[PDB]
Amino acid sequence: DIATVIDSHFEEMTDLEQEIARYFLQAETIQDDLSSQQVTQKLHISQAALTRFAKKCGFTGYREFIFQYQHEAENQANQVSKHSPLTKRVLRSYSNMREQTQDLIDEVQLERIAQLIEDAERVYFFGTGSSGLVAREMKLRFMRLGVVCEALTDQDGFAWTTSIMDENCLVLGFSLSGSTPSILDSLLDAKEMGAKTVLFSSVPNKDSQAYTETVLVATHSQPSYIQRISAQLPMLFFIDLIYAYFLEINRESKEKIFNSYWEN
Amino acid sequence: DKPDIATVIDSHFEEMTDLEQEIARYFLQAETIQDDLSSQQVTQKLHISQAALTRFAKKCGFTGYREFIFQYQHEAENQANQVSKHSPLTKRVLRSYSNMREQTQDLIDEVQLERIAQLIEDAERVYFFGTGSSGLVAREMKLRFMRLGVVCEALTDQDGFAWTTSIMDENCLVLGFSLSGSTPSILDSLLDAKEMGAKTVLFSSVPNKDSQAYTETVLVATHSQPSYIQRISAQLPMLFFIDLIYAYFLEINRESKEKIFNSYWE
Amino acid sequence: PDIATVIDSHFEEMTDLEQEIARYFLQAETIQDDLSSQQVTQKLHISQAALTRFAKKCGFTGYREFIFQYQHEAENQANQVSKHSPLTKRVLRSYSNMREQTQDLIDEVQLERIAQLIEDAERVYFFGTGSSGLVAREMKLRFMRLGVVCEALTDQDGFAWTTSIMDENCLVLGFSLSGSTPSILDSLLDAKEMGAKTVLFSSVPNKDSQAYTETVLVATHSQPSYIQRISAQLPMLFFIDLIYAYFLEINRESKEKIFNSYWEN
Amino acid sequence: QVSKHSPLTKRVLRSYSNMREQTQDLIDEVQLERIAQLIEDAERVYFFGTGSSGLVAREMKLRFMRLGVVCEALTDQDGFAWTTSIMDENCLVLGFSLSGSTPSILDSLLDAKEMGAKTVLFSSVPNKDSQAYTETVLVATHSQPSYIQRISAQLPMLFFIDLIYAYFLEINRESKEKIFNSYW
Ligand SMILES: [Cl-]
Ligand SMILES: [Cl-]
Ligand SMILES: [Cl-]
Ligand SMILES: [Cl-]
């Protein structure tokens, strides 16, 4: 804007004043003390040359010119981005995952699952690797609301625990790939025991209907394995959604339980 | 009584050049809506320039193709897709995620994160200290960085912090996670690592004033929900900065780090 | 004198059967045989009493004394003097002095009661920190395979969160080798107010332990100094294995199906 | 009604005593002092175990950490792969497999050897690939035949861990004792 007006009058300007236009056409200029004193000392010109340049540009003088020079830069810059390409690949990978999950939500299903946890006597969260930390996280959150739950992160524990579940148990299995055999095959063992089974996967079903519920979670935005964000995060979206539905079932009794940590 | 987008194209057809007319004929077909009508796929279908398409949109009275193609598709819209079908609880959880992204954006100090990435690279052995939800964060970071060749350990108890600080040396880096910013064990332990020569980084959502000592103090996002019970996963504030640091740290000597990461599959 | 000259010096006092045996033992090749006492009898087709009579003719209190001497002479190995270093003997001693002290502390009725409590509970919990956390995990691994619904906890957050959800169908077992781990003692008390039964395993009696349902006294370590003691799990592994053995005999058949279901496909 | 002690108490304690008897017979004193030295020589020491052997690995991590050894215990095979990819010539790995055929541990130790790391296998069965690792330690076999009636599966390894601990403690004892007491 102010750069275009400069170019339109650039010719009418003397070589020295043309130099002053050149300096202010630089982006680096703003990162500098732009008082008339410093500009004159810096470019080794007189005040009069500065005033003549500013009026060449249609302003009454340097003060009006520089007053806009600041505002302009503040009216932009806040419009531009101040984030590195890496900080932005990270921020967009999260935003992309929040967008995609919002498309994936089956809200009736999540309230169905919140009620299943409520009606279960014992609940178990199966996962390995990063999805085993997700399973750990669920146990702490739902324990504070009074759920009897346990987190298991290895194959011995899976088989060991499946053998002692019954129709009053609920097992939530987390397999981002939708392939992790340890988890998938152990959810099938629990069904044979009569327990209800919910599978979380970022990968569509392939006869996944064998489980009580299959929750489709978001795939990652980054195609390369190394460049992705936490493998936990797709699962955390829906844990926090399920948590929010579950908390509202008998919320009054659950807050008593949640608070009795503090109560001596 | 509203002007259908089709009636509009014809109202301007006779103001159009011949090429614009060819574009109009394509867009006047009812079966054209069942196409990918991005500007990049329409140009190739019609073998025209993006500038030629913009001119067509402007002949029809729009500010550009994006405006034109929205109305071309909004009139075909079969439902009130705009309205939020969500329930207040879903939208409470989602705002909590989005708001934390925003507060993270405003808190990032990119020079510090690269520095912390460099601290991890320059250290030979690095330890992550955390309890409860933050111990899960510490364990997650271990999975992230050990697959890039870093010598790291995740600790999740006061006894471990003590046993590890007693053997810490100057070539150690300890990252401590205390969302409240006042966890006595995490803070006491990081001073134990300081006295043993190791560098210390604290992650906290509250600007800790008495702890100007640690090599670095990183301000993390606070949760948007006032009540603890309704908050989202307490890991996520820290996960934001782990992913950022990881992104910074991966670009430092990437070839060897990708080689270690891919060696699993090897 | 050798053992063959004594066998021969009594040969003429011997019965015909005893001389047949003397003939077996006078052979040089016979010491490359299993000379147990039940093996020699089978081979010679004789009775133990007949072998004892043989030994007695040779001047021994019985066969076991005779065969020992017969095997001492041939042997040059010092199967008597220990080959171990002082450090090895000290560790083995500590492990054995713990078998001994454990044995001196066993209260068989108490351990039977404790097994029954585990059976009567619907949910069981094991609380322990450090090395006592590993014991808690092991107990969980052994008892879940007998069908018990149990959980192992290793930090204060876990104890507090789980105690607040405990009810009268709960049984919590706390491991504090020192007997004064504040988190274990307090968590056990919190579990009591929720109505659960409580068992403390400790090597130090403390007045405050009378508050819990049971106090189990475990072995103190032989080594005075912390750094030289053998381990920290060992005193409790002793009693876990004893309680387990008791607990398996309660409805064994059921817990043998659950145990073997793991192997089953 | 059940003698001085009962049949069950005698069985449990006779399993412990027999473990001590078998352990004493099998000890290879020079081997144990060799492993003690190796642990000192390594810059990083790792302990691999599954199930009950995993608890043994966690204890060894606990004990040798208080003496100054930089150690890490691993229970999940995914972690076995992640650590194997970063091990070098100055790493020592102790794998615990009571059966001697738990795949994860065997392949992990092979992988560690490929990276140039010292490897030690604990096993109640003499592994056929005995020379494969720098050392192959023989541990006690359980007295009871039936799996369900056996005493703790940990114990065979706890014996040799304390033996190695007692030897390794004497190497540079004074400095390790200072590290131990820095806790208080
Ligand atoms: Cl991503
Ligand atoms: Cl929140
Ligand atoms: Cl001892
Ligand atoms: Cl046994």
Nearest-neighbour CA in chain C from D109: distance (Å): 24
Interchain contact, D70 vs B162, CB within 8 Å: no
Q: Which two tokens stand for residue A155?
A: 């194959």
Q: What are the percentages of helix, strand and coil residues in chain C, rounded to 5? A: 60, 10, 30
3-class secondary structure, B151: strand
How many Å is the maximal CA-CA distance in chain D? 61
> What's the rounded Cα separation, in Å, for the pair C37 and C48?
7
Provide, as residue numbers in chain B, all residues whose Cβ is less than 8 Å from the Cβ of A105: 86, 90
Chain centroid to Cα C186, Å, comes to 32
| Cα–Cα distance for residue pair D36/D40, rounded to 1 Å | 7
Q: Are residues C191 and C235 in the same domain?
A: yes
Question: What distance in Å separates the CA atoms of residue D177 and residue D36, rounded to the nearest whole number?
Answer: 16
- For tokens 């520089």, the residue is A66
Residue A7, both tokens: 């170019």
On chain C, the residues whose CB falls within 8 A of the CB of A156 are 141
Q: What type of residue is C233?
A: Q
| B230 and B188 within one domain | yes
CA D6 to chain centroid, in Å, comes to: 33
The residues, any chain, with a CB within 8 Å of residue B10's CB and separated by 6 or more, are B24, B28
**Interchain CB distance below 8 Å, C242 and D62:** no
Q: Which residues pair with A215 in a beta bridge?
A: A200
Nearest chain B alpha carbon to D81: B264
DSSP string covering C64-89, please?
HHHHHHHHHHH--S-SSS----HHHH
d(CA C165, CA A254): 11
Same domain, B147 and B27: no
Helix, strand, coil abundance in chain D, percent, nearest 5: 55, 15, 35
Which among A150, A163, A261 has CB closest to C161? A261
- Do B28 and B139 lie in one domain? The reply is no
How far is the centre of ligand 4, averaged over its atoms, from the C-alpha of D120 (Å)?
Answer: 24
Q: HSE of C46 in the Cβ direction (CA atoms, 13 Å)?
A: 21
Distance CA D74, CA D88 (A): 17
* CA dist., res. A63 & res. B197, Å (int): 55
C100 and C167 in a common domain: yes
For residue B130, give the 3-state DSSP assignment: strand
CB contact under 8 Å between D72 and B162, yes or no, is no
Contact (CB, 8 A) for B168 and B196: yes
Question: What distance in Å separates the CA atoms of residue B56 and residue B62, rounded to the nearest whole number?
Answer: 9
d(CA A145, CA A259): 9
Determine, yes or no, domain membership for C177: yes
Contacting chains of D (3 CB pairs or more, <8 Å) are A, B, C
Query: C31 near C70, Cβ under 8 Å?
Result: yes
User: Which one-letter DSSP state was computed for residue B80?
Assistant: -
Please name the residue that has the structure tokens 């064990």: B185
Q: Cα separation of C164 and A263, whole Å? A: 10
Give, in order, the Cα–Cα distances in Å from C80 to each of C76, C83, D166.
11, 9, 24
* Sheet strands (E) in chain B: 125-130, 151-155, 172-177, 199-204, 216-219
Per-residue DSSP letter, A27 = S
Q: Do B90 and A84 touch (CB under 8 A)?
A: no
Q: How far is CA B113 from the centre of its chain?
A: 15
Chain C positions contacting chain B at CB under 8 Å are 129-130, 154-155, 157
Q: CA-to-CA distance for B215 and D163, rounded, in angstroms?
A: 42
* Non-local CB neighbours of B207 within 8 Å, separated by 6+ positions: B181, B217, B219
Residue indicated by tokens 């100007």: B212
Q: Which residues of A225-250 are buried (b: 16+ CB within 10 A; e: fewer)?
A: eebbbbbbbbbbbbbbbbbbbbbeee
Tokens found for residue C227? 């750094």
- Interchain contact, C129 vs B156, CB within 8 Å: no
| Alpha-carbon C61 to chain mean position | 33
Q: For residue C127, give the 3-state DSSP assignment.
A: strand
Domain boundary among C32, C51, C74: C74
DSSP C209: G
Enter the DSSP assignment of A210. Answer: G
Q: Is residue B226 part of a domain?
A: yes
The packing angle between helices A130-143 and B133-146, to 10°, is 180
What are all long-range contacts of C16-25, with beta carbons under 8 Å and residues at least 24 apart? C17/C46, C17/C50, C18/C50, C18/C53, C18/C54, C18/C57, C20/C44, C21/C46, C21/C50, C21/C51, C21/C54, C22/C54, C25/C70
Would you state the structure tokens that stand for residue B86, as one six-digit string?
Answer: 């969500």
- Whether residue A126 contacts residue A171, with contact meaning beta carbons closer than 8 Å, is answered with yes
**How far from the centroid of its chain's Cα atoms is residue C124's Cα?**
25
Cα distances from B119 to residues B113, B122, B167, B200, in angstroms, run 10, 5, 19, 10
Separation CA B104–CA B95 (nearest Å): 14
> Environment class of residue D88 by beta-carbon count within 10 Å: exposed (0-12), middle (13-18) or buried (19+)?
exposed
Cβ neighbours of residue D138 closer than 8 Å, sequence gap 6 or more: D26, D28, D123, D124, D126
Cα end-to-end span (Å), chain A: 67
D114 to chain C, minimum CA–CA distance in Å? 32
Query: What gap in Å lies between CA B228 and CA B223, rounded to an integer?
Result: 9
Nearest residue in chain C measured CA to CA from D150: C241
Q: How far does C80 lie from chain A, in Å, by closest CA? A: 45
On whether both C68 and C148 belong to a single domain, the answer is: no
- Ligand 2 centre to CA of B203 (Å) is 18
> What distance lies between CA B81 and its chain's CA centroid?
26
Cα–Cα distance for residue pair A126/B250, rounded to 1 Å:
30
Distance D53 CA to ligand 4 centre (A): 16
Query: At residue A194, what are phi and psi to the nearest 5 degrees?
Result: 95, -5
Q: Is there a domain that residue B88 lies in?
A: no
Tell how strand C197-202 and strand C214-217 pair up. parallel
Strand order in the sheet with C214-217: C150-153, C123-128, C170-175, C197-202, C214-217
3-state secondary structure of C102: helix
CB C105 within 8 A of CB D8: no
Residues 6+ apart with CB under 8 A from D101: D125
3-class DSSP state of B240:
helix
CA atoms A254, A259, A261, A263: torsion sign: negative
Q: φ, ψ for residue A161 (rounded to 5)? A: -85, -35
Nearest by Cα to C169 from C142, C140, C200, C148: C148
B247 → closest Cβ in A90, A102, A137 = A90
* Single-letter amino acid, residue A244: A
Number of domains in chain A: 2
Closest CA to B239 of B159, B160, B167, B136: B136
Using the Cα atoms of residue A155, residue A156, residue A159 and residue A161 in order, give the sign of their dihedral: negative
Copy the structure tokens of residue C77.
Answer: 């190995």
Rounded CA separation C217/C198 (Å)? 14
Q: Taking chain D, what is the end-to-end CA distance rounded to the nearest angstrom?
A: 49
* Domain contains A97: no
Which DSSP letter does residue C32 get? G
Closest approach of chain D CAs to the CA of B189, in angstroms?
12
State how beta strands B151-155 and B125-130 pair: parallel
Spacing, Cα B244 to ligand 1 middle (Å)? 12
- Rounded to 5 degrees, φ, ψ at C111 are -65, -35
Q: What order of strands is seen across the sheet that includes strand B172-177?
A: B151-155, B125-130, B172-177, B199-204, B216-219
CB B181 within 8 A of CB B206: yes
Q: How far is it, in rounded angstroms, from Cα C64 to Cα A37?
A: 116
Nearest chain D residue to A155, by CA: D76
Within a domain: B82: no
Angle at C200 between CA C199 and CA C202, to 5 degrees: 150
- Spatial distance between the Cα atoms of C21 and C19, rounded to a whole number of angstroms: 5
Classify the C-alpha dihedral D145-D150-D154-D160 as positive or negative: negative
Cα separation, C70 vs C68, whole angstroms: 5
**CB-CB contact of A196 with A187 (8 Å):** no
- Residue A183 CA, chain-centre distance (Å), reads 27
CB A184 within 8 A of CB A127: no
Query: In angstroms, rounded to a whole number, what is the distance separating the alpha carbons of residues A36 and A45?
Result: 10
Amino acid identity of B39?
A: S
User: C101 φ, ψ to 5°?
Assistant: -70, -40
Residue of C nearest to D22 (CA): C92
b/e sequence C152-179, b meaning 16+ C-beta within 10 Å:
bbbbbbbbbbbbbbbeeebbbbbbbbeb
| DSSP structure class, residue C147 | T
Beta strands in chain A (DSSP E): 122-126, 149-152, 169-174, 196-201, 213-216
CA C92 to chain centre: 14
* DSSP 8-class letter at A176: T
Residues C125 and C195 in one domain: yes
Smallest-distance ligand from the CA of A233: 1
What residues form DSSP beta bridges with B127?
B153, B174
Q: Distance between CA C206 and CA C215 in Å, rounded?
A: 9
Last residue of a domain, one of B74, B92, B116: B74
Q: Could you identify the residue written with the tokens 């236009």? A: A21
Both C143 and C240 in one domain: the answer is yes
**Contact flag A233-B236 (C-beta cutoff 8 Å):** yes
CB atoms within 10 A of CB A132: 24
Instruction: State the DSSP code for A201.
Output: E
Residues, chain B: 266
Structural determination approach:
X-ray
* Strand pairing category for D91-96 and D118-123: parallel
3-state class (DSSP) for residue D56 = helix
Q: Which residue has the tokens 């076991």?
A: C64
Out of C20, C51, C74, a domain closes at C74
Q: CA angle at residue D47 from D43 to D53, to 5 degrees?
A: 165
Name the residue range of residue C245's domain.
86-261
In SS3 terms, A29-85 reads as HHCCCCCHHHHHHHHCCCHHHHHHHHHHCCCCCHHHHHHHHHHHHHHCCCCCCCCCH
* Sheet with D71-74: strands ordered across: D71-74, D44-49, D91-96, D118-123, D135-138
Supply angle C-alpha A97, A100, A101, rounded to 5: 85
Q: Which residues of A touch C261 (CB under 8 A)?
A: 163
Given resolution (angstroms):
2.5
The CATH number covering residue B192 comes to 3.40.50.10490
CA–CA dist C173, C176 (Å, integer): 10
Residue B234 lies in a domain: yes
Q: In terms of Cα–Cα distance, which of B105, B94, B138, B151 is closest to B238?
A: B138
DSSP string, B100-128: HHHHHHHH--HHHHHHHHHHHHH-SEEEE
Q: How far apart are CA A192 and CA A209, in angstroms?
A: 15
Integer Cα distance of B62 and B53 in angstroms? 12
Task: Flag whether D2 is in a domain.
Answer: no
**Sheet containing A122-126: which strands, arranged edge to edge?**
A149-152, A122-126, A169-174, A196-201, A213-216
Residue (of D160, D151, B83) closest to C239 by Cα position: D151
Nearest chain D residue (CA) to B125: D70
Q: Do C92 and C64 lie in a common domain?
A: no
State how far the Cα of C261 lies from the Cα of A131, in Å rounded to an integer: 27
Cα(D181)–Cα(D184) distance, rounded to whole angstroms? 6
CATH number at residue B47: 1.10.10.10
Q: In whole angstroms, what separates CA A54 from the centre of its chain?
A: 47
Radius of gyration of chain C (CA): 28
- Residues C149 and C235 occupy one common structural domain: yes
**Which of helix, strand or coil describes residue A197?**
strand
Query: Within 10 A of D92 (CB to CB), how many other CB atoms are there?
Result: 24
CA C249 – CA C227 distance, rounded (Å): 39
Q: Is residue A88 part of a domain?
A: no
